[PDB]
Structures are given as C-alpha cells and as structure tokens.
Amino acid sequence: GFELSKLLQKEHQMRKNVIKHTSARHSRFGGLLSIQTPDKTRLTVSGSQALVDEKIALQKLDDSKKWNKRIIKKHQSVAAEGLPNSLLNSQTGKAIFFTESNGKHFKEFINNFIDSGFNILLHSVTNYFTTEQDRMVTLEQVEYLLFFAWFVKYQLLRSKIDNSADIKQVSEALKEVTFILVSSLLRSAYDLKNWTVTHAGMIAFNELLNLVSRTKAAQEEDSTDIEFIVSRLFSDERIQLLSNLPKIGSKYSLQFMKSCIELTHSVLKVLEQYSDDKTLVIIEVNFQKVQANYMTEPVIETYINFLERFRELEDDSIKKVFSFFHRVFVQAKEQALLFRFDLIILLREMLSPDGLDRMSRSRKYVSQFSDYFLARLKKRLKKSPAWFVGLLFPPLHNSEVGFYQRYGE
C-alpha cells in the first residue's frame, strides 16, 4: 500500500507537469502566433500554449521539422552467440517479483549455500578450469564469471546490511588462482574481441575490486596480505587495458557502458585509497598519472552517451556519473573537456520541469554540477571570446594553439 501510494504520488506529479503543456480549449479552437527573430523575420507557430511561453513555441517549431539524421544500431542477440538471457542483455531495472514466502525461501537457501560450501565449489571449479583454460567455450566462461560476480555481490550486500554474518565465506574470491584465472580470461577476451565475455569479466573485476576494498576497510592490519594481491591486479598492461575499456564502450549496448562506469569508479576509488594509505608499487604508482590516463575525449563521449538515458537510470548510476564529472572538472581542472554542447542540452533537458523529477535525490547533484559548470563557462567565455565557436566543434590538436585552447594560457 505504501509503495502504491508513493508511485501514485509520482504519477500525479508527472500528470501535473504534462497538464502545463495542454491547451484549455479544444484542438480546433485555432490561434496562430508569429514570433519575430532579431533579423526582422517572423515564423508562424500554431497552438494556444505557444502564445504565452516562448520556450514552448521554440520547442514546437523544433518538433515540426521532419528530417531526422541516421542512427544505426547493430546489436546481436545472445542466441546468435549461443548464450542465455541474463543481466548482460536485460534492462537495468527489470526485476523479478517474488511473493513473501518464495522470497524468504530463496533467501534462506542462498544464505545456507553461501555459509556452507561456496568456497569448496569455487576452488574445485577454478582448479578444474585452470587445468583446462584452452578449450573453454564462451558459454562456460560467461556462466562462471557471472556466478562469481553475483555471489560476491550478494555476500557484500549481506555483510553491509548486517554484521551477524561473516565476510570470510568468500575467502576463495581473494585466493590468487581465481584472480589469475579471471585476469587471463579478461585479457584473452579483449585480445580476441569477444565483447560478451569481456562484459562478464568487467563485472567480475568490479566485484573483486569491491570485495578487496571492503576487506581492506574492515581490517587494515591484516590488509598487508591483501596488499600483495592489489600489486598484481594493477600491472601496467592491466592499467592500460582498464583505461582503454571506457574508450571503446561508447559504441556498444547500454549495459556495457554501465559496467564501464562501475569498473572505472571502483578502480579510481581503490587507487586513491591505496595511494593515500601507502606508497603504491606494482614501478611506483601515482594517482596523478593514472587519473590523466582516464581524461580523454572518448571517455567523456561515453559518459555523455550513458547519461542520455537518465530516464531509465537509477539514482546510484546518476550519482556515480556526476561524481566522475566533478572529479574531471575540479580535481584535475580539465574544464575544456566538458565545454561541449551535448552536455548543455542534456543539462537543460534534465533540469526542465518535464525532465528529471524535481523532488528527487539526484536533482541536487545535477543542480550543483550545473551551477558550477555555468559559472566556470561564463568566466572562460568572458575571458576568451573565441570559445563562442569552440563550443560546437571538437577541440584542436595543434601544437601552436593547443595549449592556449585547452588551458587558456
């Protein structure tokens, strides 16, 4: 009942926002508006609501246009590659609804299994498939990685919710052999351009990073052993691969981009934690250089493309994308990267009354990031008149003026 009331209250707010765009009179009432642009020319826009608000008039003028630019989306079903429907291709929000009794039984069964024999099963499977790495077929790789990731995530959530349970039940997760196996599979997938297993390995790596961070936070003294494992998983080749992963993710499915966001956030958090705590050595690792490797145009393009679907997104994803935006904007002072136009349109769409819900948690982050970006952009534009044209086309790569273009000096 409470959930239904909340959903009805949200739908009522949406209806109220929609009502603002509808005319009191009927469709055939008539009424033509003539809006004159500064160059002494007037365009005719119909509709009663366009008469009072100029934004509605411009929006209707926009919508009346017929020609649409191409968008080609070549996507392959899981059945094509012989894989079953799973989190890889399902919607971010698709939830299987359970009755109280069935949900309780499912929780009890999963809890008993995790408390009983997850470690032994993982040990046996990882040893067997380390003996037989070569003949692995995509189905088995994806299934194993997904099982690992799901169980690690569930254990993490259970530990966070209550302290009665223990976090050592997934001890085999931190065991070296499993980590080497996962890294080898991910590297092979990247080399052979097998994107499905690549996505599965990305999810598994995200889960491993979450687990390592949580265990280090719980016990820092015993983390000295954990410090051994982190040194392995941040190899130069691995760092390059992780840096490149977001770059290619732009032209792929939404779930892949979500996994890219998750992995990038987790990697950045772990790297910051370890750099602050002690001297990170794989070659000493400084957070500045790894951060710089992550500031590139394709990364921002991928992030913008991800945030274009904010309507179907969750609060956590919005928070993470805006946290990364804040990092790029402030921590490294690379505002030139975010001085694009797609970001402006997206910000106005999300802050519009018909856009993201006003009484929502994410709107606070959106408003703060806007305020800051608008202030900095106004300052830069006042300083540099030429940026009035730079907002449209991509940044230059010319040595003579590249430095002035980016840093303004």
């Binding site: 469709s27 008539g30 033509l32 003539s34 100029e54």
Partner: protein, 611 residues
Amino acid sequence: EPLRIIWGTNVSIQECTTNFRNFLMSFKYKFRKILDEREEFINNTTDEELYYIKQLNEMRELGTSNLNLDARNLLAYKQTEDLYHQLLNYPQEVISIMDQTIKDCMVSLIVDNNLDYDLDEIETKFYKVRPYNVGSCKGMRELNPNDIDKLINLKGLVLRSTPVIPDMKVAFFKCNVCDHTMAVEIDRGVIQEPARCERIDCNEPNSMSLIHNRCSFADKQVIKLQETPDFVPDGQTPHSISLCVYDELVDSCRAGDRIEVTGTFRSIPIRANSRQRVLKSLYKTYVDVVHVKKVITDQDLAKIREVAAREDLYSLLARSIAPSIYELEDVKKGILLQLFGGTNKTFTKGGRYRGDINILLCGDPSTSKSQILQYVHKITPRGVYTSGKGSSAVGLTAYITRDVDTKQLVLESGALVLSDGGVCCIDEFDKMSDSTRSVLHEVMEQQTISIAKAGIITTLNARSSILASANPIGSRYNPNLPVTENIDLPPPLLSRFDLVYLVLDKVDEKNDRELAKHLTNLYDDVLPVEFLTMYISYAKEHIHPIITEAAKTELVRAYVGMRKMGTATTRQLESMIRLAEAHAKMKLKNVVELEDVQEAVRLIRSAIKDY
C-alpha cells in the same frame, strides 16, 4: 529577445497579458458606473472593492474554473481600451491569453497571500473565460463573409441538440515491441504521430499503435439555432445557424428555449468526397460558442417575513394577483389558493396523496373569466392554454410517434403532461366532446395517466392543477333553474372540482356605473409581480403544514354538517382538507389552525353561492 506577435497584426502578446493582469488585479465597479453616465449612483461599499479579486476568491472557495467577463467592464478601465477591440477582432488569441492570465492570477493570489490551500488542485485545473455583452446583437440574416473569425453576439430559439460527442485532446501511443508508452498532443485536428519509438535502445519504425481507451477526451455538442419569429421580414421559413459548445456549456440549453450566445463566427471547408483531400469551394459557416445565457438572498427573506406579519395579507395578495379585475375578491382568493396548492404527502402502505386544487369558473359570458385565465397563465411557471374544440383526447395526454434521427418509438408530452407541477387552463369546457373529457377523470383523481397501445405500456405523471371555465346553455344564466341544468356538463363531473364558482352579470344602477368607471380609466396598492412570484415559490418549496387535533375535531363536524343538509361526498371533505392546508401555506405556518379551516369552509359554501 524574440517578440511574440499575433499573426497578421502588430499587437504584442506580452502587452495584452500585462494589461489584462493589471485590469483583473485593480478594477472597481465604480468605473463601470462612471462610463455609463451613472456617477450619482456610486455607493461606498460594493463600488470601492476589487471586483475580480472577489470573483476569483469565490471561484477558489467553490472550486470552479469559470469567470464570466463583461466587455463593457474592459471599456471602463483605462489600460484595456485597445484590448476590447483586440478581443472583438482576434477572439481566439485574446481568449487564450485571457485564460492563461486568469490561471496565473489565481496562482499568484494563492502564493502571495500565503494561504494554506494546496497548489495541486489549482495547478491541474483548466481555467476558461466566458466574455459576454460584447456589443449589439447581430441578426442571423446579416452575417457576411467580412465578419468571419470575429466575436459576434446572437439570439435565437434552440431547435435540436445532438448527444454528447467525445472530442480527442491528447493521444496515447504504445510501442508494440518495448511496450513503451508516450502521449502526444493534437493540433488543428491532426495527431502529431511519431515515426519511430522515442526510446534510444528501441528504434523500430512504424511499431507505434494508438490505445483508443487511454487518450484524454473532451465534450462536444452541436446545436441548431432558429432566429426569433420577429426577425422574419416577409413571412418565410426562418433561417438556422449551427453552434458548437464544449466542456461546461454542454447540456446547458434544452430544445425549445430562447438563448443569447456569444461566440466566434467560424468557417470551415467541406470535403467533396470521403476518400480524397479535394474540397468544395463553398465553406460551411457555424459559431464557436464561448458563453450562453438563457433568456434567494437573506435580505429578501427578511423582507418576505415582514409581509407575512401584515394582518391584511390575504387581501393584499388577492388584490395583487389580478390588479385589473374589479370586485371579484372571492374569485381572486379562490384562484390564489390554487397557485399555492395543498400539502404533499409521501405515503407507503398505499399511495401518494397530492395537494392540488381544481377550480371551475362557470358564469355569464361578459364577466371576466378568460381574463383571469390569462392572468394566472402568466404567473405560473408551467402551463398550457388549451381551449375547447382546439384540443384532442390524445393531444392532451400524450402522442405516440417515432424519432427519425434515432429510428425508435418515442412518445410526446400532451398539454396535461406538459403542465406537470403547474396549473392547466381550459377556456371552453362545455364546448368539448365528452370523449376527450373522460381523460380528465383520471388526472383529477389519480394524478397520473396510463397508456397501453401499440407496444407502449407506461405511465406519465400529470401532477397538475386544472382551471376550467364554462358558459351557460342559454345566452345568460337563469337563476330559476338548478345549477345542473344551466351549465351543462355531467352532474357527477361538477362534484370532482374542488371549488365551483358562479359569477353572474346582474344589472344594477351602481354596479354597472362603477364597472364602467373602472374599465374606461384605462384610456389599493398591489405587490409587484416579480416579488409575488418569489413569495409563492418560497412558500411552495419550504413550508409544509401539518394538521392539528383542533382541525380534525371540527373538520369531522363540518363534513357531517355538509352531508346532513340533503352532491356532498367524500371529495368535499378532501377538498376542505386541501384548502385548509393551502391557506396555512399562505401565512407561512407549519400547523393548520382552526381559523384557516374555517376560512376554507367559508369559501366553499360562498362559491356555489349562499342563496
């Protein structure tokens, strides 16, 4: 800074909005009086107050989304002189601007006043303005092409209205693949349909379908208006003009009513055939209606209660009902008690008892009988002036017919049925075939008519009072012979009537002199009819007398005495009951006293006349 401008003109919409907001914010009725050269009529309470602010506050308290506007008020103000012409010449844009400004004014009033009223109700409510009194009333035969797309004022008689028609407002589309739902608006009767799904992940083209039962709808109705008979120049078929009314104005005017309508005189093409875009060169003309006008306060109640205290109220009302008729006080009194009527009784374990009084006015020809009939016909809210030999048995009760538009068997309402709750009037009762008179037997007894013929078996309520007149068989009334001989009509029928008066034109040197002096002055105050109608309506609606023991104790005596002297049947006792109840209604009493029943019996004996 693009400037919004109405198409084809040079009026800035922002100027219109600000001027209308200022006019609504600060307007006092004193300006209207000043404009009409009525300066000396300005008071200090009503004319010194913000009119439209009170109108909007009353709207909010009553939860309404309508504000009737007067153009002469716009002319009264200073900043809205040009707005009157703009409204007259470009009605659609100005009306939309006024609606939006009214909504903005309500929102600003709520926000600034810091009231506790929730903003949700006002935010989701559509507000509409209904201007009227926009100038002289044009004739239905004077609308030229020059007056297309301009605000006009019309008056006519409603002839026929179609049932409610649903008109789409917002369409609803659902993607067949991803089950994604979106709503799109309708402009100029065209759906702005999408080519492909608006979602990014799913872009399958031509996969969107219209869900008919989830689209928002509005109300539409089409009316036919016939010009008033007076406007007809040389006695031809009166012209007709079609009207369209939406939302609130639907089901506001019934068939056969005189209305004054303000709207836009629109024009629209007619397609030559169903399966082509081709259009006829001749355009159809019609009117888009924006306002319709069909042509008690505590102070009045305090005033009405003052009259009731007057000792000579009976004489005042009897003298005011028919001012012109001279020296017929008893006839007037009898007529008045019919308007008030008896008391209504709802009665299970039996049948309903209705307090309706029937009066017969039979007498010598030249006496004022038909004049009183017309006088009462004017006062009553409902009634049919049926005559003798001009009405039929079926015509009085009901006529079985068929509806061409619906092709279904329907029945019309006859003269008696059309008078439900009023007072029927008949002029020449004697000059009526007994076949038709037999219909009145059931009306006066059961207050209902039952019809069973040609597959229609139903009963129509005819709860109406009958007021008939008759003339003597001879050229005059002869006192020598008894009543049953002089007036005709079956003897039993005369017993049904509650009161049967007898007015005769005796010859005298003083009565004739006074009558002649009274009917020649045309070439003792009386209440204005407007107030009298309100008086009788209030008495008929609120008051409900209840008999007392003292009434019964002497009513039994009166009835038994009436029967002892001898025609006198139970109907006479029921008539006494009804008359006693009716007279109590006049004085606004909830209990019938001995005096009222004494007056009733006094009236009954002195009607037939106390030889």
